[PDB]
Amino acid sequence: CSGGHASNKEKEMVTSLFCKLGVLVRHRISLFGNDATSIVNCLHILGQT
Amino acid sequence: RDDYDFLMQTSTYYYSVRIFPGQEPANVWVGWIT
Amino acid sequence: PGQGRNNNGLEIGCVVDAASGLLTFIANGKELSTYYQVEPSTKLFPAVFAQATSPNVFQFELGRIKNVMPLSAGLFKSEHKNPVPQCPPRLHVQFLS
Amino acid sequence: NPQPVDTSNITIPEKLEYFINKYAEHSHDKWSMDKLANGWIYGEIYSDSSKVQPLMKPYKLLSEKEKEIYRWPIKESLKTMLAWGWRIERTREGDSMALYNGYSPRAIDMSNVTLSRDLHAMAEMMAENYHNIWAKKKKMELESKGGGNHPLLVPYDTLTAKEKAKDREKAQDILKFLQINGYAVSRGFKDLELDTPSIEKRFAYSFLQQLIRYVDEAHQYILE
């Protein structure tokens, strides 16, 4: 209630970021230099947000 | 100077307030309150 | 003159006539136009309202002018006939809180 | 690399003559008090060894040859305030003085005149500029000499409070005396447009479209 409003534009941009990075992680684990763990951790955090 | 008899018989009293140079004077009011 | 003075600090003098209730103000040796007439038996407290724009704001000078008693003569009964100005420890500055 | 604003671009306005008045009378009065403090007294002849004054007289009796160069630092102190374009005005109470129109000089009181916070920052910048000017002249002089170093070569920020006391007291006295005259200085210009409704300027916005662009680029390079 103190503030910290997140704009609607900001949130569809967050959703598009989530979807596009999911597209990146699609079948690209081999190309990722073992950073798939970091990929899926960011997957979580954007999921909760 | 001042008349001693007039001072003995009068009932007029006086005080003064000096606003120091640098204190904005429109921000200062002087007078009496009840 | 107004505005900023730097010859000396502004001396605002308040004169009260306890027998007539006339309140007259003197600024830098001249009589101001503002005057007040009060009711009999009115008790008047010397007061200064100021907004601070300096480390030193103002001071209560308890002197006297020609043909007038000092404030201590009016305040204290024992000094009713003493023309010498005085500031006994009972008199002190109070503020609204 | 000090870079004071050039002063030849603009010129002094005419209405500031009355502000230069009373202030030259300051500089003379305080400096005559300094003369009394260190010992100078009247002589029709100037004697540096015998500690002798010819230049006591009221600023009116002081000649035109004095008037020049003596105000010159005052002229550049005024030029520094005008060149940045800071908006300066008068109250009509200020023109009240003009409409109302040996010798013992009057002791002139800086004691309780106080500045505002924005005006501090304002005068801190102008005194910082004065120091930048002054130090740039030292780098010219010492490079002409070809040798030596100076403790004050460090920037205004690096200088200590006692080292900066000179410029602080100069800035304070001048802006406080502009206070006493009632001139009012403020910011030079206001913003052409405040796009406060814009979500685009928010930090998260720019952060995300930078992310959008770079991650889209990365995605297409991963495709490649």
From Swiss-Prot, chain A:
Post-translational modification: Channel activity is modulated by phosphorylation. Phosphorylation is increased in failing heart, leading to calcium leaks and increased cytoplasmic Ca(2+) levels.
Domain of life: Eukaryota
Induction: By TGFB1.
Disease named in the record: Ventricular tachycardia, catecholaminergic polymorphic, 1, with or without atrial dysfunction and/or dilated cardiomyopathy: An arrhythmogenic disorder characterized by stress-induced, bidirectional ventricular tachycardia that may degenerate into cardiac arrest and cause sudden death. Patients present with recurrent syncope, seizures, or sudden death after physical activity or emotional stress. CPVT1 inheritance is autosomal dominant. Ventricular arrhythmias due to cardiac ryanodine receptor calcium release deficiency syndrome: An autosomal dominant arrhythmogenic disorder characterized by syncope, cardiac arrest and/or sudden unexpected death, often in association with physical exertion or acute emotional stress. Patients who survive manifest polymorphic ventricular tachycardia and ventricular fibrillation. Unlike typical catecholaminergic ventricular tachycardia, arrhythmias are not reproducible on exercise stress testing or adrenaline challenge.
Quaternary context: Homotetramer. Can also form heterotetramers with RYR1 and RYR3. Interacts with FKBP1A and FKBP1B; these interactions may stabilize the channel in its closed state and prevent Ca(2+) leaks. Interacts with CALM and S100A1; these interactions regulate channel activity. Identified in a complex composed of RYR2, FKBP1B, PKA catalytic subunit, PRKAR2A, AKAP6, and the protein phosphatases PP2A and PP1. Interacts directly with FKBP1B, PKA, PP1 and PP2A. Interacts with SELENON. In cardiac muscles, identified in a complex, composed of FSD2, CMYA5 and RYR2.
Function: Cytosolic calcium-activated calcium channel that mediates the release of Ca(2+) from the sarcoplasmic reticulum into the cytosol and thereby plays a key role in triggering cardiac muscle contraction. Aberrant channel activation can lead to cardiac arrhythmia. In cardiac myocytes, calcium release is triggered by increased Ca(2+) cytosolic levels due to activation of the L-type calcium channel CACNA1C. The calcium channel activity is modulated by formation of heterotetramers with RYR3. Required for cellular calcium ion homeostasis. Required for embryonic heart development.
Name this protein carries in UniProt: Ryanodine receptor 2
Organism this protein belongs to: Homo sapiens (Human)
Full protein segment contained here: 2991 to 3039 of 4967
UniProtKB/Swiss-Prot annotation, chain B:
Cellular location(s): Sarcoplasmic reticulum membrane
Signal peptide (residue range): none
Expression tissues: Detected in heart muscle (at protein level). Heart muscle, brain (cerebellum and hippocampus) and placenta.
Top-rank taxon, per record: Eukaryota
Induction entry: By TGFB1.
PTM annotation: Channel activity is modulated by phosphorylation. Phosphorylation is increased in failing heart, leading to calcium leaks and increased cytoplasmic Ca(2+) levels.
Quaternary structure and partners: Homotetramer. Can also form heterotetramers with RYR1 and RYR3. Interacts with FKBP1A and FKBP1B; these interactions may stabilize the channel in its closed state and prevent Ca(2+) leaks. Interacts with CALM and S100A1; these interactions regulate channel activity. Identified in a complex composed of RYR2, FKBP1B, PKA catalytic subunit, PRKAR2A, AKAP6, and the protein phosphatases PP2A and PP1. Interacts directly with FKBP1B, PKA, PP1 and PP2A. Interacts with SELENON. In cardiac muscles, identified in a complex, composed of FSD2, CMYA5 and RYR2.
Involvement in disorder: Ventricular tachycardia, catecholaminergic polymorphic, 1, with or without atrial dysfunction and/or dilated cardiomyopathy: An arrhythmogenic disorder characterized by stress-induced, bidirectional ventricular tachycardia that may degenerate into cardiac arrest and cause sudden death. Patients present with recurrent syncope, seizures, or sudden death after physical activity or emotional stress. CPVT1 inheritance is autosomal dominant. Ventricular arrhythmias due to cardiac ryanodine receptor calcium release deficiency syndrome: An autosomal dominant arrhythmogenic disorder characterized by syncope, cardiac arrest and/or sudden unexpected death, often in association with physical exertion or acute emotional stress. Patients who survive manifest polymorphic ventricular tachycardia and ventricular fibrillation. Unlike typical catecholaminergic ventricular tachycardia, arrhythmias are not reproducible on exercise stress testing or adrenaline challenge.
Family: Belongs to the ryanodine receptor (TC 1.A.3.1) family. RYR2 subfamily.
Protein role: Cytosolic calcium-activated calcium channel that mediates the release of Ca(2+) from the sarcoplasmic reticulum into the cytosol and thereby plays a key role in triggering cardiac muscle contraction. Aberrant channel activation can lead to cardiac arrhythmia. In cardiac myocytes, calcium release is triggered by increased Ca(2+) cytosolic levels due to activation of the L-type calcium channel CACNA1C. The calcium channel activity is modulated by formation of heterotetramers with RYR3. Required for cellular calcium ion homeostasis. Required for embryonic heart development.
